Design a protein around this ligand. Structure first.
Ligand SMILES: Nc1ncnc2c1ncn2[C@@H]1O[C@H](COP(=O)(O)OP(=O)(O)O)[C@@H](O)[C@H]1O
Ligand SMILES: O=C(O)C1C=C(O)[C@@H](O)[C@H](O)C1
Ligand SMILES: [Cl-]
Ligand SMILES: [Cl-]
Ligand SMILES: [Mg+2]
Length: 165
């Protein structure tokens, strides 16, 4: 079981806080997206391209179940994983840190468009708020710890999580 499972919208800091929290804890980081494309040689985006969310999520939920079981480090859940009820069920009892980010800051951190398909450019701010409106309640469902990453620099979010694990 992971030291901590990180959930949040794109830009909330999963990959970042994950890497830093993993390092701090001396443990490894496991990003389910990477765990997904590695295990498939075919990229997340391109995966969707060929088989769509219905399939992606099936693959994703299965890697998550796996990571939740065999990973003792820090696990960063790909943003939409929470939408799969089986991902939510798999999460129960685990240490789930919901990295909270406002839509304004969130739209801005992901400003570079470092992938994030559902977050395509044409009217991203609107897109991100809708996305936040939909995923937000779910992250709050599965979260055992909510961390506001809005003001806090990465180090402080990480120390905040450490201080609380
Ligand atoms: N607390 C933070 N303060 C400032 N920038 C952050 C913070 N958390 C993450 N970032 C930055 O925002 C960008 C998105 O972070 P990332 O970890 O890739 O998000 P996610 O994987 O959750 O989608 C990264 O450049 C990262 O450096
Ligand atoms: O918020 C989301 O649905 C997504 C979050 C990331 O994990 C991407 O890899 C997924 O493809 C999409
Ligand atoms: Cl299981
Ligand atoms: Cl994501
Ligand atoms: Mg990520």
């Amino acid at each position: 079981a992971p030291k901590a499972v990180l959930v949040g919208l794109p830009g909330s800091g999963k990959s970042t806080i994950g890497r830093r929290l993993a390092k701090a804890l001396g443990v490894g980081l496991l990003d389910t997206d990477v765990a997904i494309e590695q295990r498939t040689g075919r990229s997340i985006a391109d995966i969707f391209a060929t088989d769509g969310e219905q399939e992606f999520r099936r693959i994703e939920e299965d890697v998550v179940r796996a990571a939740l079981a065999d990973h003792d480090g820090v696990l960063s859940l790909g943003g939409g994983a929470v939408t799969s009820p089986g991902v939510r069920a798999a999460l129960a009892g685990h240490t789930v840190v919901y990295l909270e980010i406002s839509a304004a800051e969130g739209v801005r951190r992901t400003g570079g468009n470092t992938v994030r398909p559902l977050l395509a450019g044409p009217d991203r701010a609107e897109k991100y708020r809708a996305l936040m409106a939909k995923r937000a309640p779910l992250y709050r469902r599965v979260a055992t710890m909510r961390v506001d990453t809005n003001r806090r620099n990465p180090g402080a979010v990480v120390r905040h999580i450490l201080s609380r694990l």
